[PDB]
Design a protein around this ligand. Sequence first.
Ligand SMILES: Oc1cccccc1=S
Ligand SMILES: [Zn+2]
Length: 257
Amino acid sequence: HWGYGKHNGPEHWHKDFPIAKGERQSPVDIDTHTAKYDPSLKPLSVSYDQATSLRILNNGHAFNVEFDDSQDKAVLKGGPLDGTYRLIQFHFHWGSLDGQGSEHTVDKKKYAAELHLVHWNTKYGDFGKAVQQPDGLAVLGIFLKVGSAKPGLQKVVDVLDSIKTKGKSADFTNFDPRGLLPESLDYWTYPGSGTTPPLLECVTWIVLKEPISVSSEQVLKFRKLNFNGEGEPEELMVDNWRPAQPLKNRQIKASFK
Ligand SMILES: Oc1cccccc1=S
Ligand SMILES: [Zn+2]
């Protein structure tokens, strides 16, 4: 099955998931000089005051912080979006080294990691239906650079010992995702896809310009997680990122000059 290794990594995924070579795949390089400022783009509305986190899961490819999405509690709207998108989970992609790990790049620059806050369009009722629609998901992408610690990340880092291996979960209530956001909500936006199989082309990407800083110790702890199950040979969960894919017939828009 798919993964991030030599024999089952991103260069292989097209054999089981032919959409890997499609017309609106993600991630992409964000060429900041080529992105066009769109003064009609609205400010992003991030409404996380009532977010209800539930659980954290190691799925064998990343860890997901899951939310109660059975009511409009943590929603994204505005920006390039029409309508209301509910937060279902967040996750990260990260490197073996601080010089790599992000999926999106900025003028070819790679960040140490990238946080994806996954939201689904409430006009489609559930996440599973939404992923079959070209406007089904909105993913807020935030870059991580190594420097000062992010205090609001530390509760995540502290639980990772309890979900070291594939299939482990832990209760993870009362986590406030507002503590992972940078100051500015200036963004880039384009149409694309999930970055893991099944690579469905259902995502409006919203990539914040301003990274967050995390400490070297925080991202070190991400790198101690395992892709394997308990009792299987240890394979560190590192370099779980897809490289940039061809832009094809797409324009990246900027909310800012
Ligand atoms: O990595 C992902 C995993 C699962 C669902 C939706 C979006 C992304 S980027
Ligand atoms: Zn992702």
